[PDB]
Every structure is written in structure tokens, then in C-alpha cells.
Coordinates of C-alpha atoms in Angstrom, one line a residue:
Chain A
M1 CA 81.3 68.1 -99.5
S2 CA 77.7 69.3 -98.8
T3 CA 75.8 66.3 -97.6
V4 CA 72.0 67.2 -97.8
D5 CA 69.9 65.4 -95.2
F6 CA 66.2 65.2 -94.5
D7 CA 64.7 64.2 -91.2
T8 CA 61.3 62.5 -90.7
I9 CA 61.4 60.6 -94.1
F10 CA 59.8 57.1 -94.4
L11 CA 61.1 54.2 -96.5
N12 CA 58.7 52.0 -98.5
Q13 CA 55.7 53.0 -96.1
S14 CA 57.8 52.3 -93.0
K15 CA 56.0 52.9 -89.6
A16 CA 59.2 54.5 -88.2
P17 CA 60.6 57.8 -89.5
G18 CA 64.2 57.9 -90.6
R19 CA 67.0 60.3 -91.7
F20 CA 67.4 60.4 -95.5
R21 CA 70.8 61.5 -96.9
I22 CA 72.1 62.3 -100.4
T23 CA 75.8 61.5 -101.0
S24 CA 78.1 61.3 -104.2
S25 CA 78.2 57.5 -103.5
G26 CA 74.3 57.2 -103.6
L27 CA 71.2 57.5 -101.4
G28 CA 71.1 56.5 -97.7
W29 CA 68.2 56.0 -95.3
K30 CA 68.5 55.2 -91.5
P31 CA 65.6 54.7 -89.0
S32 CA 65.5 57.3 -86.2
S33 CA 66.7 55.7 -82.9
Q34 CA 63.6 56.8 -80.8
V35 CA 61.4 53.7 -81.7
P36 CA 62.1 50.2 -80.3
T37 CA 61.6 48.5 -83.7
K38 CA 62.3 44.8 -83.2
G39 CA 64.4 44.8 -86.4
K40 CA 67.9 45.4 -88.0
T41 CA 69.1 49.0 -87.4
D42 CA 71.2 48.8 -90.5
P43 CA 71.1 51.8 -92.9
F44 CA 69.5 51.3 -96.3
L45 CA 72.0 52.2 -99.0
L46 CA 71.3 52.6 -102.8
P47 CA 74.5 53.1 -105.0
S48 CA 74.5 56.1 -107.4
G49 CA 75.0 53.6 -110.4
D50 CA 71.7 51.9 -109.7
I51 CA 69.6 55.1 -110.0
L52 CA 67.7 55.2 -113.4
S53 CA 65.1 58.0 -112.9
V54 CA 63.4 59.9 -110.0
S55 CA 59.8 61.1 -109.8
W56 CA 58.2 63.6 -107.4
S57 CA 54.5 63.2 -106.5
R58 CA 51.8 63.5 -103.8
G59 CA 52.0 60.7 -101.2
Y60 CA 50.0 60.0 -97.9
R61 CA 52.5 61.8 -95.6
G62 CA 53.2 64.9 -97.8
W63 CA 55.3 64.5 -101.0
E64 CA 56.8 61.2 -102.2
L65 CA 60.2 60.7 -104.0
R66 CA 59.9 57.6 -106.1
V67 CA 63.3 56.3 -107.3
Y68 CA 63.4 53.8 -110.2
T69 CA 66.4 51.5 -110.2
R70 CA 68.2 49.8 -113.1
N71 CA 67.3 46.4 -111.4
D72 CA 63.5 47.1 -112.0
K73 CA 62.9 47.9 -108.3
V74 CA 60.9 50.9 -107.1
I75 CA 62.0 52.7 -103.9
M76 CA 59.4 54.9 -102.2
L77 CA 60.5 57.8 -99.9
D78 CA 57.6 59.7 -98.3
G79 CA 57.4 62.6 -95.8
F80 CA 58.8 65.5 -97.8
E81 CA 57.4 69.1 -97.7
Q82 CA 56.5 71.0 -100.9
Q83 CA 59.5 73.4 -100.2
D84 CA 62.0 70.5 -100.3
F85 CA 61.3 70.1 -104.1
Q86 CA 63.6 72.9 -105.2
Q87 CA 66.5 71.6 -103.0
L88 CA 66.0 67.9 -104.0
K89 CA 65.8 68.9 -107.7
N90 CA 69.1 70.8 -107.6
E91 CA 70.9 68.1 -105.5
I92 CA 69.7 65.1 -107.6
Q93 CA 70.6 66.9 -110.8
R94 CA 74.1 67.9 -109.4
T95 CA 74.9 64.5 -107.8
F96 CA 73.4 61.9 -110.2
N97 CA 72.7 64.0 -113.4
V98 CA 69.1 62.8 -113.2
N99 CA 66.0 65.0 -113.9
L100 CA 63.5 65.1 -111.0
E101 CA 60.1 64.6 -112.9
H102 CA 56.9 66.1 -111.3
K103 CA 54.1 63.5 -111.8
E104 CA 50.5 64.8 -111.3
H105 CA 47.9 62.1 -110.4
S106 CA 44.2 61.8 -111.4
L107 CA 41.9 62.9 -108.5
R108 CA 38.6 62.4 -110.5
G109 CA 37.4 59.3 -108.5
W110 CA 36.7 57.3 -111.7
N111 CA 37.3 53.5 -111.7
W112 CA 37.7 53.3 -115.5
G113 CA 40.8 54.1 -117.5
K114 CA 43.7 52.3 -119.3
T115 CA 46.3 50.0 -117.7
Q116 CA 49.9 50.5 -118.9
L117 CA 52.6 47.9 -118.1
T118 CA 55.7 50.1 -117.4
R119 CA 59.2 48.4 -116.9
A120 CA 59.0 48.2 -113.0
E121 CA 55.3 49.0 -112.2
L122 CA 51.7 48.4 -113.4
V123 CA 50.1 51.9 -114.0
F124 CA 46.4 52.6 -114.1
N125 CA 45.7 55.8 -116.1
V126 CA 42.5 57.9 -115.7
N127 CA 42.1 60.7 -118.4
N128 CA 45.8 60.4 -119.5
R129 CA 47.0 60.8 -115.8
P130 CA 48.2 58.1 -113.4
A131 CA 45.6 57.3 -110.8
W132 CA 47.8 54.6 -109.1
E133 CA 50.8 52.4 -109.7
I134 CA 51.7 48.9 -108.3
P135 CA 55.4 47.8 -108.3
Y136 CA 55.8 44.3 -109.8
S137 CA 57.8 43.3 -106.7
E138 CA 54.6 43.8 -104.6
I139 CA 52.5 41.4 -106.9
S140 CA 52.6 37.8 -105.4
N141 CA 50.4 36.1 -108.0
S142 CA 48.0 36.8 -110.9
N143 CA 45.0 34.7 -112.1
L144 CA 42.5 35.0 -114.9
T145 CA 39.1 34.7 -113.1
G146 CA 36.9 35.4 -116.2
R147 CA 37.0 35.9 -120.0
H148 CA 37.5 39.6 -119.2
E149 CA 38.7 39.5 -115.6
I150 CA 42.2 39.5 -114.1
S151 CA 42.8 39.1 -110.3
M152 CA 46.2 40.2 -108.9
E153 CA 47.2 39.0 -105.4
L154 CA 49.6 41.3 -103.5
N155 CA 52.2 40.1 -101.0
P156 CA 50.5 41.3 -97.7
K157 CA 53.6 42.1 -95.6
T158 CA 53.4 40.4 -92.2
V159 CA 56.8 39.6 -90.6
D160 CA 59.9 39.2 -92.8
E161 CA 63.5 39.4 -91.4
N162 CA 64.3 42.2 -94.0
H163 CA 61.3 44.6 -94.0
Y164 CA 60.2 47.6 -91.7
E165 CA 56.7 47.4 -90.1
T166 CA 54.1 48.9 -92.4
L167 CA 51.6 51.4 -90.9
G168 CA 47.9 51.3 -92.0
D169 CA 45.4 49.4 -94.2
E170 CA 47.0 47.0 -96.6
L171 CA 45.9 46.2 -100.2
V172 CA 45.7 42.4 -100.7
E173 CA 43.9 41.9 -104.0
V174 CA 43.1 44.0 -107.1
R175 CA 40.6 42.8 -109.8
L176 CA 40.6 44.4 -113.2
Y177 CA 38.0 44.1 -115.9
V178 CA 39.5 44.3 -119.5
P179 CA 36.8 44.3 -122.2
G180 CA 37.3 43.3 -125.8
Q181 CA 38.5 40.3 -128.0
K182 CA 42.4 41.2 -124.8
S183 CA 42.6 40.1 -121.1
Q184 CA 44.5 36.9 -121.9
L185 CA 47.3 38.9 -123.7
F186 CA 47.4 41.4 -120.8
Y187 CA 47.8 38.4 -118.4
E188 CA 50.6 36.9 -120.5
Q189 CA 52.4 40.3 -120.7
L190 CA 52.0 40.9 -116.9
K191 CA 53.4 37.4 -116.2
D192 CA 56.5 38.1 -118.4
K193 CA 57.2 41.5 -116.8
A194 CA 56.4 40.6 -113.1
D195 CA 59.0 37.7 -113.5
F196 CA 56.8 35.0 -111.8
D197 CA 57.2 31.3 -112.6
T198 CA 59.9 30.2 -115.2
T199 CA 57.7 28.6 -118.0
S200 CA 56.3 25.3 -116.6
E201 CA 59.2 23.1 -115.3
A202 CA 57.0 20.8 -113.3
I203 CA 58.4 17.6 -111.7
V204 CA 55.0 16.1 -112.7
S205 CA 51.7 17.3 -114.3
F206 CA 48.2 15.7 -114.1
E207 CA 45.7 17.0 -116.6
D208 CA 41.8 17.2 -116.5
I209 CA 41.4 16.3 -112.8
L210 CA 37.7 16.7 -111.6
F211 CA 37.4 18.7 -108.3
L212 CA 34.1 18.5 -106.4
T213 CA 35.4 21.4 -104.2
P214 CA 36.1 24.0 -105.6
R215 CA 33.8 22.7 -108.4
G216 CA 35.8 22.5 -111.7
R217 CA 38.4 20.7 -113.8
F218 CA 42.0 21.5 -113.0
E219 CA 45.5 20.7 -114.2
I220 CA 47.7 19.9 -111.2
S221 CA 51.4 20.8 -111.8
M222 CA 53.8 19.8 -109.0
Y223 CA 57.1 21.5 -108.2
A224 CA 59.8 21.0 -105.5
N225 CA 58.4 23.8 -103.1
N226 CA 54.9 24.3 -104.5
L227 CA 51.7 22.8 -106.1
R228 CA 49.9 24.7 -108.9
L229 CA 46.3 24.2 -109.8
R230 CA 45.5 25.6 -113.3
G231 CA 41.8 26.0 -114.2
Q232 CA 39.8 27.6 -117.0
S233 CA 38.6 30.4 -114.7
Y234 CA 41.2 30.4 -111.8
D235 CA 44.9 29.6 -111.1
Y236 CA 46.1 28.7 -107.6
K237 CA 49.6 28.4 -106.2
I238 CA 49.7 26.3 -103.0
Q239 CA 53.0 25.9 -101.1
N240 CA 53.9 22.3 -100.0
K241 CA 54.2 23.6 -96.4
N242 CA 50.5 24.8 -96.4
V243 CA 49.3 21.2 -97.1
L244 CA 48.4 19.9 -93.6
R245 CA 46.8 16.5 -94.5
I246 CA 46.2 14.2 -97.5
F247 CA 43.2 11.8 -97.4
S248 CA 42.8 8.9 -99.9
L249 CA 39.2 7.6 -99.5
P250 CA 37.1 5.2 -101.6
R251 CA 33.6 6.4 -102.4
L252 CA 30.8 4.0 -101.3
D253 CA 29.6 3.7 -105.0
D254 CA 32.6 1.4 -105.5
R255 CA 33.2 3.2 -108.9
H256 CA 35.1 6.3 -107.7
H257 CA 38.0 7.3 -105.4
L258 CA 38.4 10.6 -103.5
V259 CA 41.7 12.4 -102.8
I260 CA 41.3 15.2 -100.3
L261 CA 43.8 17.9 -99.4
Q262 CA 43.6 20.0 -96.2
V263 CA 45.2 23.4 -97.0
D264 CA 46.0 26.2 -94.4
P265 CA 45.5 29.1 -95.3
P266 CA 42.3 27.9 -97.0
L267 CA 42.1 28.6 -100.8
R268 CA 39.8 31.6 -101.7
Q269 CA 37.5 32.0 -104.7
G270 CA 36.1 35.5 -104.4
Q271 CA 34.4 35.5 -100.9
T272 CA 34.1 31.7 -100.4
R273 CA 36.9 29.7 -98.8
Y274 CA 38.0 26.1 -99.4
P275 CA 39.9 24.6 -96.5
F276 CA 39.5 21.2 -98.2
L277 CA 40.1 20.4 -101.8
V278 CA 38.1 17.3 -102.9
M279 CA 39.3 15.5 -106.1
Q280 CA 37.2 12.7 -107.7
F281 CA 39.0 9.9 -109.7
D282 CA 37.6 6.9 -111.6
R283 CA 39.0 3.7 -110.0
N284 CA 39.7 2.3 -113.5
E285 CA 41.6 5.4 -114.6
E286 CA 45.2 4.3 -115.2
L287 CA 48.1 6.7 -116.0
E288 CA 51.8 6.2 -116.8
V289 CA 54.1 9.1 -115.7
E290 CA 57.8 9.7 -115.8
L291 CA 59.2 12.4 -113.4
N292 CA 61.0 15.3 -115.0
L293 CA 64.1 15.1 -112.8
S294 CA 67.9 14.7 -113.5
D295 CA 69.4 11.4 -112.2
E296 CA 71.7 13.4 -109.8
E297 CA 68.8 15.3 -108.3
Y298 CA 66.6 12.2 -108.0
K299 CA 69.3 10.2 -106.1
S300 CA 70.3 13.1 -103.8
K301 CA 66.8 14.4 -102.8
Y302 CA 64.0 12.0 -103.9
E303 CA 65.4 8.4 -103.7
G304 CA 63.1 6.3 -101.5
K305 CA 60.4 9.1 -101.5
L306 CA 59.4 9.0 -105.2
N307 CA 59.6 6.5 -108.0
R308 CA 61.6 7.6 -111.2
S309 CA 58.8 6.2 -113.4
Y310 CA 55.3 5.1 -112.3
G311 CA 53.9 2.2 -114.4
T312 CA 50.3 2.0 -115.7
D313 CA 48.7 2.1 -112.2
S314 CA 45.5 3.9 -110.9
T315 CA 45.9 7.7 -111.3
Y316 CA 44.8 8.4 -107.7
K317 CA 47.6 6.1 -106.3
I318 CA 50.3 7.8 -108.4
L319 CA 49.0 11.2 -107.3
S320 CA 48.8 10.2 -103.6
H321 CA 52.4 8.9 -103.7
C322 CA 53.7 12.1 -105.5
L323 CA 51.9 14.3 -102.9
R324 CA 53.4 12.2 -100.1
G325 CA 56.9 12.5 -101.5
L326 CA 56.8 16.3 -102.2
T327 CA 54.8 17.5 -99.1
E328 CA 56.3 14.9 -96.7
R329 CA 52.7 14.5 -95.3
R330 CA 51.3 11.0 -94.4
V331 CA 48.4 9.8 -96.6
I332 CA 45.4 8.9 -94.4
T333 CA 43.7 5.8 -95.8
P334 CA 40.4 4.2 -94.5
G335 CA 40.9 2.8 -90.9
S336 CA 39.9 -0.6 -89.4
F337 CA 36.2 0.4 -89.4
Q338 CA 33.9 -1.8 -91.5
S339 CA 30.1 -1.0 -91.8
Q340 CA 27.5 -3.8 -91.5
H341 CA 27.7 -3.8 -95.4
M342 CA 31.5 -4.2 -95.3
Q343 CA 31.9 -0.6 -96.5
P344 CA 34.7 1.8 -95.3
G345 CA 32.1 4.5 -94.5
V346 CA 28.4 5.3 -93.9
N347 CA 25.8 7.4 -95.8
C348 CA 24.5 10.4 -93.7
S349 CA 23.2 14.0 -94.0
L350 CA 24.9 16.9 -92.3
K351 CA 22.0 19.6 -92.2
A352 CA 20.7 19.8 -95.9
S353 CA 23.9 18.2 -97.4
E354 CA 23.9 14.5 -98.1
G355 CA 27.3 12.7 -97.8
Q356 CA 29.6 10.0 -96.5
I357 CA 31.1 9.7 -93.0
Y358 CA 34.4 7.9 -92.6
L359 CA 35.5 6.6 -89.2
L360 CA 39.3 6.7 -89.5
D361 CA 41.7 5.5 -86.8
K362 CA 42.4 9.1 -85.5
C363 CA 39.5 11.1 -86.7
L364 CA 35.9 11.3 -88.0
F365 CA 35.9 12.7 -91.6
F366 CA 32.7 13.8 -93.5
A367 CA 33.6 14.0 -97.3
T368 CA 30.8 16.2 -98.8
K369 CA 30.6 20.1 -99.0
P370 CA 31.0 21.3 -96.4
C371 CA 33.9 18.9 -95.6
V372 CA 34.2 18.3 -91.8
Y373 CA 37.3 17.0 -90.0
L374 CA 36.9 16.0 -86.3
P375 CA 40.0 14.5 -84.4
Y376 CA 39.0 12.1 -81.6
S377 CA 41.2 14.1 -79.2
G378 CA 38.9 17.1 -79.6
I379 CA 35.6 15.1 -79.2
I380 CA 33.9 15.5 -75.7
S381 CA 31.1 13.0 -76.3
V382 CA 29.0 11.4 -79.0
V383 CA 25.2 11.4 -78.4
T384 CA 23.0 8.9 -80.4
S385 CA 19.4 10.2 -80.7
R386 CA 16.3 8.6 -82.3
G387 CA 14.9 10.8 -85.1
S388 CA 12.4 5.1 -87.4
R389 CA 14.7 3.0 -89.8
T390 CA 17.3 5.7 -89.2
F391 CA 19.1 7.4 -86.2
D392 CA 21.1 10.6 -85.7
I393 CA 24.6 11.1 -84.3
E394 CA 25.4 14.3 -82.4
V395 CA 29.2 14.9 -82.0
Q396 CA 30.0 17.3 -79.2
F397 CA 33.4 19.1 -79.2
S398 CA 35.0 22.1 -77.5
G399 CA 33.9 24.5 -80.3
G400 CA 30.2 23.3 -80.8
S401 CA 28.2 20.3 -82.0
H402 CA 27.6 18.5 -85.4
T403 CA 24.4 16.5 -86.0
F404 CA 24.7 13.8 -88.6
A405 CA 21.2 12.7 -89.5
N406 CA 19.5 9.9 -91.6
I407 CA 22.0 7.1 -90.7
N408 CA 20.7 3.5 -91.1
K409 CA 19.9 1.9 -87.7
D410 CA 21.8 -1.3 -88.6
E411 CA 25.0 0.8 -88.6
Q412 CA 24.4 1.9 -84.9
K413 CA 26.2 -1.0 -83.2
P414 CA 29.4 -1.1 -85.4
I415 CA 29.7 2.7 -85.0
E416 CA 29.3 2.6 -81.2
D417 CA 31.8 -0.3 -80.7
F418 CA 34.4 1.5 -83.0
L419 CA 34.0 4.8 -81.1
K420 CA 34.2 3.1 -77.7
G421 CA 37.4 1.3 -79.0
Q422 CA 38.9 4.7 -79.9
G423 CA 38.2 5.9 -76.3
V424 CA 35.3 8.3 -77.3
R425 CA 32.5 8.7 -74.7
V426 CA 29.2 7.4 -76.3
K427 CA 25.9 8.4 -74.7
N428 CA 22.7 6.5 -75.9
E429 CA 19.9 9.0 -75.0
Chain B
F1 CA 27.4 59.8 -118.8
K2 CA 26.6 61.6 -115.5
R3 CA 29.9 63.5 -115.0
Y4 CA 31.1 63.4 -111.4
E5 CA 34.5 64.3 -109.9
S6 CA 36.0 63.8 -106.4
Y7 CA 38.7 66.5 -106.4
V8 CA 40.1 69.1 -108.9
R9 CA 43.2 69.9 -106.8
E10 CA 45.5 67.9 -104.4
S11 CA 44.9 70.7 -101.7
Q12 CA 41.3 69.5 -101.4
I13 CA 42.4 66.1 -100.0
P14 CA 41.7 66.0 -96.2
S15 CA 44.8 66.4 -94.0
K16 CA 43.4 63.6 -91.8
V17 CA 44.3 61.2 -94.7
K18 CA 48.0 60.7 -93.7
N19 CA 48.0 57.5 -91.5
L20 CA 47.9 55.4 -94.8
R21 CA 44.3 54.1 -94.0
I22 CA 40.9 54.1 -95.6
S23 CA 39.1 57.4 -95.1
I24 CA 35.8 58.8 -96.2
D25 CA 35.0 62.4 -97.3
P26 CA 31.2 63.0 -97.0
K27 CA 31.6 66.6 -98.5
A28 CA 33.3 65.4 -101.7
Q29 CA 31.2 62.1 -101.7
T30 CA 34.5 60.2 -102.0
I31 CA 36.2 57.1 -100.6
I32 CA 40.0 57.6 -100.2
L33 CA 41.9 54.2 -100.5
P34 CA 45.6 53.5 -99.6
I35 CA 47.1 52.0 -102.9
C36 CA 50.9 51.6 -102.6
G37 CA 51.5 54.7 -100.5
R38 CA 49.1 57.0 -102.5
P39 CA 45.7 58.5 -101.4
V40 CA 43.5 57.3 -104.3
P41 CA 40.0 58.9 -104.4
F42 CA 37.0 56.9 -105.6
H43 CA 33.7 58.8 -106.0
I44 CA 30.5 57.2 -104.4
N45 CA 29.0 56.9 -107.9
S46 CA 31.8 54.6 -109.1
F47 CA 31.3 52.4 -106.0
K48 CA 28.7 49.6 -106.4
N49 CA 28.7 47.5 -103.2
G50 CA 31.2 45.9 -100.7
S51 CA 31.6 43.0 -98.2
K52 CA 33.5 42.6 -94.9
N53 CA 35.1 39.3 -93.7
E54 CA 36.8 38.6 -90.3
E55 CA 39.9 36.3 -90.6
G56 CA 42.1 35.6 -87.5
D57 CA 43.6 38.9 -86.3
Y58 CA 42.7 40.7 -89.5
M59 CA 39.5 42.3 -90.9
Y60 CA 39.1 42.2 -94.7
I61 CA 37.0 44.7 -96.7
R62 CA 36.2 44.0 -100.4
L63 CA 35.0 47.1 -102.3
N64 CA 33.3 46.4 -105.7
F65 CA 33.0 49.2 -108.4
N66 CA 30.7 49.6 -111.4
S67 CA 31.9 47.8 -114.5
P68 CA 30.1 46.8 -117.7
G69 CA 28.8 43.1 -117.7
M70 CA 28.6 43.3 -113.8
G71 CA 26.2 46.2 -114.2
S72 CA 23.8 47.9 -111.8
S73 CA 19.9 48.2 -112.1
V74 CA 20.3 51.6 -114.0
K75 CA 18.6 51.9 -117.4
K76 CA 20.6 52.1 -120.7
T77 CA 20.0 56.0 -120.9
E78 CA 22.3 56.9 -117.9
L79 CA 25.6 55.1 -117.2
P80 CA 27.7 55.6 -114.0
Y81 CA 30.8 55.5 -116.4
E82 CA 31.5 56.9 -119.9
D83 CA 30.9 54.6 -122.8
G84 CA 34.1 52.9 -124.0
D85 CA 34.9 49.5 -125.5
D86 CA 38.7 50.3 -125.0
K87 CA 38.1 51.3 -121.3
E88 CA 39.4 49.0 -118.6
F89 CA 37.8 49.1 -115.2
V90 CA 38.8 48.6 -111.5
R91 CA 36.3 45.9 -110.6
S92 CA 37.2 45.3 -107.0
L93 CA 39.8 46.1 -104.3
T94 CA 40.4 44.0 -101.2
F95 CA 42.0 45.6 -98.1
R96 CA 43.0 44.1 -94.7
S97 CA 43.5 45.7 -91.2
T98 CA 44.4 44.5 -87.7
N99 CA 41.9 47.0 -86.2
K100 CA 38.5 45.2 -86.6
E101 CA 36.2 47.9 -84.9
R102 CA 37.4 50.9 -87.0
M103 CA 37.3 48.8 -90.2
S104 CA 33.6 47.9 -89.4
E105 CA 32.8 51.6 -88.8
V106 CA 34.5 52.6 -92.1
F107 CA 32.4 50.0 -93.9
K108 CA 29.2 51.3 -92.2
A109 CA 30.1 54.9 -93.2
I110 CA 30.7 53.9 -96.9
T111 CA 27.3 52.1 -96.9
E112 CA 25.5 55.1 -95.4
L113 CA 27.2 57.5 -97.9
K114 CA 25.9 55.3 -100.7
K115 CA 22.4 55.3 -99.2
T116 CA 22.4 59.1 -98.9
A117 CA 23.7 59.5 -102.5
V118 CA 21.0 57.1 -103.9
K119 CA 18.2 58.8 -101.9
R120 CA 19.3 62.3 -103.2
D121 CA 19.4 61.0 -106.8
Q122 CA 15.9 59.5 -106.4
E123 CA 14.6 62.8 -104.9
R124 CA 16.2 64.7 -107.8
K125 CA 14.5 62.4 -110.4
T126 CA 11.1 62.8 -108.6
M127 CA 11.5 66.6 -108.8
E128 CA 12.6 66.8 -112.5
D129 CA 8.9 67.0 -113.2
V130 CA 6.8 70.3 -113.4
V131 CA 6.6 70.3 -109.5
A132 CA 8.6 73.6 -109.5
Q133 CA 5.7 76.1 -109.9
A134 CA 4.6 79.5 -108.5
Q135 CA 3.5 79.3 -104.8
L136 CA -0.3 79.4 -104.2
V137 CA -1.6 83.0 -104.8
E138 CA -4.2 83.9 -102.1
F139 CA -7.5 85.5 -103.1
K140 CA -7.5 89.1 -101.8
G141 CA -11.2 89.1 -101.0
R142 CA -13.4 86.6 -99.0
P143 CA -12.5 83.2 -100.5
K144 CA -15.2 80.5 -101.2

């Protein structure tokens, strides 16, 4: 039985070269033993029954053999020479009864064309030739960012127990512009083919929530492992693990209530980043919500963490409890600090931005763009300076200083006594 | 439409483009981008502008391309793309790399290539006049 083998072949853009083998049982690839690749040494094996079609085309490292599977996966093998084409064509035809298709790619350098959703890959065609293709398995998320604009986020391979180290510059995000009244249908078709979320089976949804940061109205759909924010011009998927902290803070206007999420990695809207998501509720807004959970799943996983039904209570309380139950993060409420005016915080300006400073039991928190979180364990000293009916507070920490200006002088003594009580060094100079 | 093309044949692609990274060809006025294991050319005339962001151990480059709606300062008489209501456009591509220094150099070289292209196009437009004329013919006798 003539086993045909190729040395120096790379699997899915692997950094390490391997030995590729064609057998009557299928395709095999094994990494070459000369590189200490922290990583399973196990041979990749593809059964002959799983092969649908095979294309030959120009890759980075020479020629690329792209294998389409019946399971809608694309396998990329790069590193072949141009001479190997005749041998590969004869062996693939003989062994699998599959034609090796030669696919020529557009080299014109044009950024316009037609997108074409093929079974396993998104294809961008320039002058009736493929310019590039993206496998649906590499797409992590997709989001409509405009009436004619579709943003696709790609899974940026970092460290997974099942993937070979990739070598080079990695594509993270692709934005397409689809003119005509058409981008929404393309987004729906991309969602169906890339097999993302199953419909919207959300444990709970909250409609029409006002965000101060990012600025907009968003629907919040909660799932067991993730939180979704749906907006008119942007969709975000946040994993429950990425939520670091939840703040529930009353605004000094005594008419609104702030719920603030710290997220790591910070959410990204084009170039700008949002490490804090600031939601604004009316205090008089009441909502009744039943959880979409089976009685067996509720008892086994969520008993004592979530209520089965929430009565007609304030929306921000229900939301804060749901976030606590699903993220397992503690909600940070206002601390024992009370201003001269019996308020839970003080009005101040950070640079050109007017806002509210909250002195919480473990941290100083400034709740207006930009949002500033300062733990007391990181504060070296607080300096009070005279600008005056007002005074300024400079907070020094290991990474710099923050000057909060325009604070009423009557609030000076309560703030100093509280900060001294928290063990922070106050200097009055 | 000002017809431009990066390459006619795959043999024109620089052999240096093999380490799966962003590479620039000043001769073909082309940016070569690593999209899913393929060396995708983009001509400097399809490129609009870009940004660079540093994030932890990685450096991000966003490259923005010409698309209708998000248009450039060019007049209605000459588009950097062919007119087409049914044409879809690559508006932006974002890449990341662990090597910050090289990625900063690549961004500088893309920006320089764009400046040289715009300067050459301005120089061409300034010359498209009647400036091309016979060189001064010296008087054979004693000139005034």
C-alpha cells in the first residue's frame, strides 16, 4: 500500500512543521519532533468518510490544501510546493474519489466586491474571484454597528489545550459595509450559518435600559454563562466570569439609581474602551419578572441565589439581585459615609468632567465618564489643597495622582474623618 | 474610476511574505495582509487611514479602507472605487501582534507609502496643465 507523505507541512497555520500522510483510512498530520511545543504530541487524524471536497490554492508558505469536511469544518494544510500538485491530485482522486479543485484568488488590491455565505466559510469575491475566505468556526461574534455596517469579531487564538501555537499577525475584527435597502438580512443569514446563539433562551430579559456609558438604550438578556447587551447600533456578549464588580449607587438627585458593572476585558466600541458600564434607572420604575427556568434546574443550581418570581419591586433591585445570582459577584452598595447634607456621595469635578464621588467602605468610586475606581489598599496619601467656598482633593497612588476639584468646603471634615477611619494617610497642605 | 491593480500574477508576490505577517510592497504600492493563512493584497489607493493601539502584551493596528458614506475629500468626478449600488466594501480590518516595535514600524511605512502616493497624485494633477512645452529656444545672435 503506497503511503504518500509530505514533510514540512503546517496544520491550520501551526508554528511547528509536521509530516502529512495520505492513507486509505483518511488524512493524518503529526508535528515534527524537533520543536519543544508545550502541547499534546498526538497526531491529527481526519477519517476518509468526513472529506467532502478539496481545494488547492496559494497560501503564505507556498501552496495550501484546503479540505472541506461534511461537519462544516475547514482544515488548512500549507507548505506544499507547486510540483506536489500532480501527485496530490492523483492520490486524492485514487484514495477518496474527490476532485482536487484549483482555486485562483483575486490579487487586484480592491476592497470592494460581493460577499457570499458558503456552507462552511464566508467568501469575499473581487471581480468574480475569491479575495479571501473566513471559516465560520473562526468567527466568535457578529454585530450590526450601522444601518449598512456589519462587524465580525474573530476568536483571537491565545492558549487553548487543543490548538497548536499560531505564527504571525492575527486578524481580530472585520468590518463590512453592505449598501442598499440588505445588511440586516445578511446579518441574520450569517447568524444562522455560523451557528451562534440558539434563538434567545434568556433566563431573564430587561428591555429599554438607559446606559450613560456606552451612551445608548440596550436590552439586557441574561444567560447561565453570559450576559448579552442588544442595542440599535451594537450587540455585546459579556461572559459572567469577565464581570469583576457590581456597584449599586443612588444618584444625589434622589430621583435616579445607578447600576455600574466593571468588565475585564473592557468592552470596545470602535477605538474607545468601556471598562465600566453605567446604567441609569428611575427609582420609581417597578418591574415584575418571572425567571425562564424549569423547577428541577431552579432547585438544583439557583435555589437561595435567585428568586423564582420577583414581585413588583424597583427594576434596579431585581437587576442587581439577578446579576449577583448569575455572576456570583458581591453587589457593592453605599458605605457608612454620610455627607454634611446626609448624602451618600459628594459633587466634584475630575478635570473637565463634573460628577459624584462615593466613599465606599473599601474604595473611592467616581461615577461619571470617565469612571474611576480607587481601592484604599492602593492609595499612598490624600492631599487636600485650597483652590474659596470649595477645596480640591489629590489622591496619590502607585500609578499616578487624581485631582478632584470644586468640592464644597463643608464636606472637608466628614471626608477627612472617614478617610482617616479607613487607614488612609491624609495630608492637609 | 481610477483603475489601479496590485498584482496580475501570484509570482509577483514578494517571497519575504511567508511568516504570516503584515508586509508592505513599495514597488507595487500594496499592503499585504494575513487573512486566514492567505496573503491578501490591498492597493494604497483603497487604503484610507489607520490607527494603532497598545493593549497589554499585544499591539493592535486598525486599517480603514475607502467606502461610500464614509468617503474621502475627493470630488464626485474621480472615485477610488468603481460605482456600484450592489458592491459591498471591506471597511476596516483590525490585526494584533505580540511584537510592538515591528508593528509600529509597519504602521509608519504604510503611512509614508500613503503620503508618497498622495504627493505623486498632486504632482500629476498640477502637471496635467499645458506645462509640457518646447524648451526655451536660444537666440542665435546677440540677445537683448
